[PDB]
Amino acid sequence: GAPATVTEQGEDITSKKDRGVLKIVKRVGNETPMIGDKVYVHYKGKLSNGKKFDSSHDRNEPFVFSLGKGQVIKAWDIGVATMKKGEIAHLLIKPEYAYGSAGSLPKIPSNATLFFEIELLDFKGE
Numbered sequence: 001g002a003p004a005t006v007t008e009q010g011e012d013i014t015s016k017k018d019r020g021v022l023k024i025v026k027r028v029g030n031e032t033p034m035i036g037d038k039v040y041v042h043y044k045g046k047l048s049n050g051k052k053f054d055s056s057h058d059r060n061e062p063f064v065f066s067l068g069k070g071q072v073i074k075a076w077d078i079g080v081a082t083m084k085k086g087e088i089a090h091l092l093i094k095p096e097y098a099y100g101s102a103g104s105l106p107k108i109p110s111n112a113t114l115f116f117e118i119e120l121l122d123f124k125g126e
C-alpha cells in the first residue's frame with residue numbers, strides 16, 4: 001500500500017527527526033515555497049483507519065492556502081515547503097503533526113495518523 005511504502009522507506013522531514021512527517025517523492029518536479037507564499041495543490045487524503053477520505057478533485061479544482069500561517073495542519077506547512085513545482089509526494093503523518101490527542105471530533109479521531117498525496121502545481125507571493 002502507498003502508506004506502507006512511506007513507513008518503510010520514506011524520508012523523515014521533521015526538524016526533531018521524530019518520524020512525525022514522512023515523505024516519498026513519487027514524481028520529481030523541476031525552488032521550494034517560502035513562508036507566506038500562496039500555494040496551489042491537488043491532494044487526496046485519508047485516515048489510517050480507512051474510514052474517511054477527501055480529495056481536492058471533489059471540488060474539481062486546486063486547493064489554495066498561505067504557507068506557514070497555520071491555516072492547515074503543521075505537516076502540510078512543513079511538507080509542502082519541501083516540494084518543488086511539478087512534484088508529487090506522499091506524506092504519512094503522526095497525530096503530533098495533525099490533530100493530536102484531542103483529534104477533530106468526530107471528523108478526525110483522537111490520535112489519528114493521516115496520509116496524503118499532494119501535487120504541487122504552483123506557488124505565488126504575497
Ligand SMILES: COc1cc2cc(OC)c1OCC[C@@H](O)[C@@H](O)CCOC(=O)[C@@H]1CCCCN1C(=O)[C@H]2C1CCCCC1
Pocket residue numbers: 043045046047052053054071072073076104107108114
Ligand atoms: C478537520 O477538518 C477537515 C479536514 C480535512 C478536510 C476537510 O474538509 C474538506 C475538513 O473540514 C473543513 C475544514 C477545512 O478548512 C480545513 O480547516 C481543514 C484543515 O485540513 C488540513 O489542514 C488538512 C490538509 C489540507 C487538506 C485538508 N486536511 C485535512 O485534514 C482533511 C482530512 C484528511 C483526512 C480525511 C478526512 C479529511
